[PDB]
Structure 1
């Protein structure tokens, strides 16, 4: 800029200069590889690899690495990277966004940093929007990476896990943002370590970040899976349950335990023909629904704990007394209550797993992306991913003529007008490209064109290859191309034979999109490196953008002033007005992302623990130790509840506790009055943990030393998986129900955090307990195989911006 205002430019200027100098240091040694041998150059990779093991940094080997790559390309493709492209690669290396105007060769640039970071062999994900480009780039760019002798994988959904694994095994991988995501997702629902496809997230280079990180980032990734019409279980459970009402079927006033174990419950339960007493098949599976249905009656009371309704069952916020917006009870106790109250029980798809692009890409050791349009939301990138946008210079100065948006009083005037411009160019040789924003628009003008006898091609985003074929030639003399939402993104238009002197491309925007960014990408398609072009925008007072800006008063002045008379008008001020209109739209969306993120941050934290513990359970050599850590943490909880806030030491209630452990961790008489008397809550834990240890021991020598190691893993996964999957579905429900009935004054997100954490807290407890219960009591019958908890088929999708 000029004058004062030029200091906002300072943080960019300073960096840009490092990068300029460096690009030069690179061009200096153009000689060092210029004349060399194909195989000598390949040995460079190795030299670097060695040099790295020794202790150097990617930053140290950067210049040379880039020089090598630079040579490698000319050799392979015949293209020798520009000084600007070198600057871009570096930017990328420094973990930033390389704003390199559409057509500066962002693809080739990726190679440099990609190559250099790939050397540690840690892996690099180069990502794009669609499977066409992904496969396209991999193929063309791979030949340089492979020449320098580096493995190159391509991940698509149509690939077996084994195929996927091989793709990820590569020194470098190409894939869609969606594939990456979903993979990470499925990757964490795996039963055995070897089934995961992904390798640790190292570095990701996102081609066209704005699209990925911004647009495709309005909603999250989900994996659903239904329940097998199970209803019949709860019905039967509820029925059965209210039978054995006696204290030969125990309960807790303190812990709220529905202790079935008694022979009344047991024997009369096995009577239900549960293939007798097979605790490991049954108890994990069937005895779960029972223990719920039991509590549902005993512990849960109609209008003190919950509430019955026409909208079904609600929870009552204790101590405030409220209709709990959207919250269900854990592990399907909600269903057991409905059965007990006869209400229709619901069985929808459960959300098995979820993460947001934002929280995903955040997961890498390093991220970087490239695109032409980004400074627009530099505030966002810098904020969320800590990537600063760097506007890389152009190779050749721009000479394209960007024309001021033309305004109209009607859609029909506007549209009808566009058809003429096309005509004029058409009848001169000028190749035209018209950008619509929706299907209808693109076909409306199609009619207007065929009517006027102008031959044309229409792109409406399907098998991008087909369109790409079409679009590449869209820059020839009789080129008349219609693009619905930049349908041929990434593929560049080269100025046709003789078209050079015909003017240039001359693209034409039928309207403006909700983002400058996107209508600016439209602009982008002309002037491909010094090439000439014209860009014309068309708008009308009856446009959605307009009639959403509350622009009626303005509509009236024109009308009242007979302005629809002079019709094609250019008011810098009205264009500025739409500029703000856009900024607002964008602002709203940024707000939407900002929110989506926040609700998930609550999740990511929860995932950190789970995911990690889960993984822990799969590198399961020495598992027992955790299993005991968990039994002990379950046990401690019992003790501390029978010994509340110092409520009279040996005057606690040292005889329910006694009878409990004795009945839920051990099997009747073993723990009694005497055993634990005159001991602090701490003293007691160890005493009995010890007798649990004694018992745990016993089982290793009675049911298989190392089979148990798997018993443990099975139980723990069964536990974790079952609990977790639930809580998540639960958490997805809450996240969109809390937005209902909330005069609480607080921000919902707040409630969410608080309530979310709470349940989580619970689930941990639940898990630890289930684990302890089974490992101590559960009985081995046949094959102790780690078993799947997902019922039936799954579905991996991204919802619609709703």
Structure 2
């Protein structure tokens, strides 16, 4: 009858007497024991049962908490590299402590990660005490800390950190000038609290490191000036199929003549082409004083309604600057990206991955597809008696909010604590105001000060408490019921709307009814709601409209509530399909980053840089030979003198009559002797430094240009097929060629500089 996780739970509960009656020292020793056993054969799995019991016993002694059996089940699923779905209040923090210890024994490190520094720091100091008791070191990585400090934190057996810091740290480690400046060790094991926020909602969120130089605007003015000379039908068309303004065949020929290009679509010209396309979208697609407006010397997006009158927001993909160039305004600069990674791409590098959260089931497929991780749903310790009521539907938001306030006021008069969840600050203010008019004391949490938020939330289950929380403000702080609150029905949770994703709704819902407590949840919606403007959602509302529904006769039916849930499943499914497709595109740059980072590390880790540099030189020399050896017009000889050697070093006299590979051996042998002489004049150690500064400069600067070009390639890929074949293959192929071209640039730059400078 009993399953794998239940069995192991019992195993650990059976041998509890074995650790129950040990002094602290004999108990702490178990850590040394386990280690001795590991290094001489035993696998981490072999020890799970005992190690878990040790932690289990140690927590009771330092915290007073003794992990429940469900917490033991969750612990196993985490060890297995899966996702433990454990409802809010099941004690995920203490639960994580089991697999973290086990997986830290081999001394390879474990990153424990959350959404903000308040939480990482709270959990570190609280769970740290258990680990330090077991003779383990615990580090805390924070944004305000120095390199040396970060290095120490990462050198601990266990490291707590935010996901942002881990990602930034990793990027900076790939920008260093010496190996020793790195702060991270290899990525061993990450256990991710709030795993759905981090691995799903932020899956594609890019972390970026910018340079301090301003991106040049030359291309913007060049493109703008070329576009002005264009003629309206001779040179361009609004393509119905692609929904865009494109150059005609004549326009491309004209652009190719105007600059010095053979083929405008060639990958080496992606930037030129894209700027031209934007300046073309800005000049004939964006009507001035219609699409946008100019305030002073700035440009503002109207937006339909405008709705956005003077928003501070701007158009993406260089479109904004293309308009500024058109409008003769100042081109507002943006710094260049030196390094980038998304969280999906970052966490995919760990040897092992695990995660825990209250809400993962609705994303089961997403975790499997993207991360190849199972969602293991762990039973609650106590039955869930919380009453989750079908949605209430109103005709107008005005009506909905009025009902929300009245609900809150009623529950307040009884003393029953109330938690109100909203999706936006403006809604929060709106509800708060309504409550002030009724004379109802309450607190507002606008997701700003995490530390203050947790203090308020700690108190939100006391008699007479009323708390308004915008977007899961104060997440990660359990809300306990005060004296006599059980008797009052527990925490009442009112949601003032539903998110596009049901998962986010469930997070709010789960804040009530913890550890078997009674409680009630109720969501409110209206015809005018944003979510209620969808395909299958709006139809239902349209009918209720015709039926004769009123703000004074809200609908509350199982059918309609299910219609809402189903419509959210459908939308989730669309989002998941888009995410799937975006991921495949992301993978092209992801793989290129891995190849170039490995090559860059090779450079700073290299015993002698000679071999790496020589190969670059030769590889580059071979391309010079081929370009002249399709009688042969050398040509090549003259070029060689100004690139790898000295004036008149090579000879016309050698011109020649030899097989090309023969020439390579001969010319490379001449290069090697010149190189040898340079090294002798520099001294070898000073030659290494010199080569290193050159190679890293070549790599760092061509990588930066490449990120910029790849981004432009992607933004405009829908114009490079050939619709409606799928552009993914076109992007992969062009991405591949552009990367090769980048590698070739790096090689040429290095070769020229070490040979010809200084």
Provide the C-alpha distance between the structure 1 equivalents of 2:296 and 2:466, rounded to a whole number of angstroms: 60
CA separation of 1:332 and 1:693: change in aligned 2, threshold 3 A: farther
Deviations 1:334-360 (A, max 9, x none): 999999999999963111111111011
Deviations 1:269-313 (A, max 9, x none): 999999999999999999999999999999999999999999999
Q: Kindly state the Cα deviation for residue 445 of structure 1 after the two structures are TM-superposed.
A: 1.5
Q: Kindly state the Cα deviation for residue 683 of structure 1 after the two structures are TM-superposed.
A: 2.4
Q: Kindly state the Cα deviation for residue 24 of structure 1 after the two structures are TM-superposed.
A: 0.9
The gaps in structure 2 that reach 5 residues or longer are none
Q: 1:316-715 to 2 correspondence within 5 Å? A: 348-549=334-535, 551-564=537-550, 567-643=553-629, 652-653=631-632, 655-675=634-654, 677-715=656-694
Asked if 2 retains the 8 angstrom alpha-carbon contact of 1:419 and 1:449, the reply is yes
Could you say what secondary structure the match of 2:45 adopts? coil
Asked if 2 retains the 8 angstrom alpha-carbon contact of 1:85 and 1:109, the reply is yes
Provide the C-alpha distance between the structure 1 equivalents of 2:19 and 2:727, rounded to a whole number of angstroms: 61
CA separation of 1:339 and 1:711: change in aligned 2, threshold 3 A: farther
Aligned length: 756
The two structures, once aligned, show a CA RMSD in angstroms of 10.5
Deviations 1:342-383 (A, max 9, x none): 999996311111111101100100110000100101101111
Q: Kindly state the Cα deviation for residue 116 of structure 1 after the two structures are TM-superposed.
A: 0.7
Could you say what secondary structure the match of 2:231 adopts? coil
Could you say what secondary structure the match of 1:71 adopts? helix
Q: Kindly state the Cα deviation for residue 714 of structure 1 after the two structures are TM-superposed.
A: 1.4
Asked if 2 retains the 8 angstrom alpha-carbon contact of 1:325 and 1:740, the reply is no
Could you say what secondary structure the match of 1:234 adopts? helix
Asked if 1 retains the 8 angstrom alpha-carbon contact of 2:90 and 2:381, the reply is yes
Asked if 1 retains the 8 angstrom alpha-carbon contact of 2:274 and 2:716, the reply is no
CA separation of 1:239 and 1:27: change in aligned 2, threshold 3 A: closer
Deviations 1:91-148 (A, max 9, x none): 0000000001111100001101001111111111111111111111011010001111
Quick check: 132-141 or 495-504, which moved more?
495-504
CA separation of 1:390 and 1:670: change in aligned 2, threshold 3 A: same
Asked if 2 retains the 8 angstrom alpha-carbon contact of 1:503 and 1:532, the reply is yes
CA separation of 1:238 and 1:124: change in aligned 2, threshold 3 A: same
Deviations 1:738-796 (A, max 9, x none): 3567654333433332222222111111111111111111xxxxxxxxxxxxxxxxxxx
Asked if 2 retains the 8 angstrom alpha-carbon contact of 1:249 and 1:259, the reply is no
Quick check: 179-188 or 334-343, which moved more?
334-343
Q: Kindly state the Cα deviation for residue 565 of structure 1 after the two structures are TM-superposed.
A: 7.4
CA separation of 1:266 and 1:659: change in aligned 2, threshold 3 A: farther
TM-score of the pair, normalised by structure 1: 0.79
Deviations 1:319-345 (A, max 9, x none): 999999999999999999999999999
CA separation of 1:131 and 1:565: change in aligned 2, threshold 3 A: closer
CA separation of 1:572 and 1:753: change in aligned 2, threshold 3 A: same
CA separation of 1:328 and 1:740: change in aligned 2, threshold 3 A: farther
Could you say what secondary structure the match of 1:92 adopts? helix
Q: Kindly state the Cα deviation for residue 455 of structure 1 after the two structures are TM-superposed.
A: 1.6
Provide the C-alpha distance between the structure 2 equivalents of 1:576 and 1:622, rounded to a whole number of angstroms: 67
Deviations 1:510-551 (A, max 9, x none): 121111111111110112111111111111112111123465
Asked if 2 retains the 8 angstrom alpha-carbon contact of 1:606 and 1:760, the reply is yes
Quick check: 281-290 or 633-642, which moved more?
281-290
TM-score of the pair, normalised by structure 2: 0.83
Quick check: 171-180 or 319-328, which moved more?
319-328
Q: 1:26-65 to 2 correspondence within 5 Å? A: 26-65=12-51
Provide the C-alpha distance between the structure 1 equivalents of 2:690 and 2:249, rounded to a whole number of angstroms: 26
Quick check: 268-277 or 576-585, which moved more?
268-277
CA separation of 1:265 and 1:590: change in aligned 2, threshold 3 A: closer
Asked if 1 retains the 8 angstrom alpha-carbon contact of 2:245 and 2:281, the reply is no
CA separation of 1:576 and 1:711: change in aligned 2, threshold 3 A: same
CA separation of 1:699 and 1:405: change in aligned 2, threshold 3 A: same
CA separation of 1:258 and 1:764: change in aligned 2, threshold 3 A: farther
Could you say what secondary structure the match of 2:345 adopts? helix
Deviations 1:610-658 (A, max 9, x none): 1111111111321101111111111111122222xxxxxxxx5163223
CA separation of 1:389 and 1:716: change in aligned 2, threshold 3 A: same
CA separation of 1:347 and 1:632: change in aligned 2, threshold 3 A: farther
Deviations 1:705-753 (A, max 9, x none): 2211111111111211121122112222333243567654333433332
Provide the C-alpha distance between the structure 2 equivalents of 1:552 and 1:241, rounded to a whole number of angstroms: 44
The gaps in structure 1 that reach 5 residues or longer are 1-14, 644-651, 778-801
Q: 2:701 aligns with which of 714, 722, 728?
A: 722
Q: Kindly state the Cα deviation for residue 243 of structure 1 after the two structures are TM-superposed.
A: 27
Could you say what secondary structure the match of 1:331 adopts? coil
Larger relative contact order (Cα-Cα within 8 Å, sequence gap ≥ 6): 1
CA separation of 1:286 and 1:773: change in aligned 2, threshold 3 A: farther
Could you say what secondary structure the match of 2:497 adopts? coil
CA separation of 1:266 and 1:377: change in aligned 2, threshold 3 A: closer
Asked if 1 retains the 8 angstrom alpha-carbon contact of 2:245 and 2:285, the reply is no
CA separation of 1:248 and 1:212: change in aligned 2, threshold 3 A: closer
Is residue 2:80 matched to residue 1:94? yes
Asked if 2 retains the 8 angstrom alpha-carbon contact of 1:327 and 1:734, the reply is no
Asked if 1 retains the 8 angstrom alpha-carbon contact of 2:420 and 2:495, the reply is yes
Provide the C-alpha distance between the structure 1 equivalents of 2:675 and 2:242, rounded to a whole number of angstroms: 26
Quick check: 502-511 or 312-321, which moved more?
312-321
Asked if 1 retains the 8 angstrom alpha-carbon contact of 2:238 and 2:246, the reply is no
Quick check: 255-264 or 47-56, which moved more?
255-264
Asked if 2 retains the 8 angstrom alpha-carbon contact of 1:356 and 1:597, the reply is no
Provide the C-alpha distance between the structure 1 equivalents of 2:749 and 2:231, rounded to a whole number of angstroms: 24
Q: Kindly state the Cα deviation for residue 236 of structure 1 after the two structures are TM-superposed.
A: 16
